[PDB]
Copies of this chain bind each other. A is one copy, B any other.
Amino acid sequence: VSAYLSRPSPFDLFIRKSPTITCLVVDLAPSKGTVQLTWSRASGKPVQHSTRKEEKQRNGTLTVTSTLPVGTRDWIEGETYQCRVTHPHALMRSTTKTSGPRAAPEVYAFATPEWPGSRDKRTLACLIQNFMPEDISVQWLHNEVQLPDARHSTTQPRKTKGSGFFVFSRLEVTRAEWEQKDEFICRAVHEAASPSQTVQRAVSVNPG
């Protein structure tokens, strides 16, 4: 049995201004009975109502999730939020905003050339590197509209040669999409980015 507590996504925190944190509890057996996830703030001040979700996995695991809305000013000013896991057959996790040097991300967008026999599709790629810390949100937009999250896949932050991190994002598109409008935007949201914590670059397929 292991538990994890995440920080707010930069998109939710800075753009949407509705940050949430998630207590993710993975139960191995799972022992009979209901797990309890209890939220608190280090200050002892009130917390909002949380959402709870659980589902039995294919391999037999019970996965439990609790998502807590947090105040925007509360989080940025350094509040510590705590998740307590209770199971009869005690785990404590906490989260607060990281401290340390900040660095904005570099962003680059690319499009693959045509692969023989696959005329109706291309792969778009985005390199986002040299940012600090590793918390970052990546989105893809078409027609100034964000595409669904499941359309793309973004790698985990790996360390660069020095202090910074990098991620790669991949988005498969169709010929119908780029013929409707041949411009796609990779957008990164990061605490150290400027202005408005947003950095974005565009790419076009430029078909023959």
Contacts and interface: CB of A to CB of B under 8 A. Distances in A.
A102 to B, nearest CB: 15
A42 to B, nearest CB: 22
Interface stretch (A83-91, A142-150, A185-193): A142-150
A166 B170 contact: yes
A123 interface: yes
Main secondary structure of the interface of A (DSSP, over half): strand
How many A residues touch the partner, as a band? 35 or more
Interface of A: 34, 49-58, 106, 108, 110, 112-113, 115, 123, 125, 127, 129-130, 142-145, 153, 155-156, 158-161, 166, 168, 170, 172, 176, 180-181
The 3 A-B residue pairs with the shortest CB-CB distance, nearest first, are A168-B168, A52-B54, A51-B55
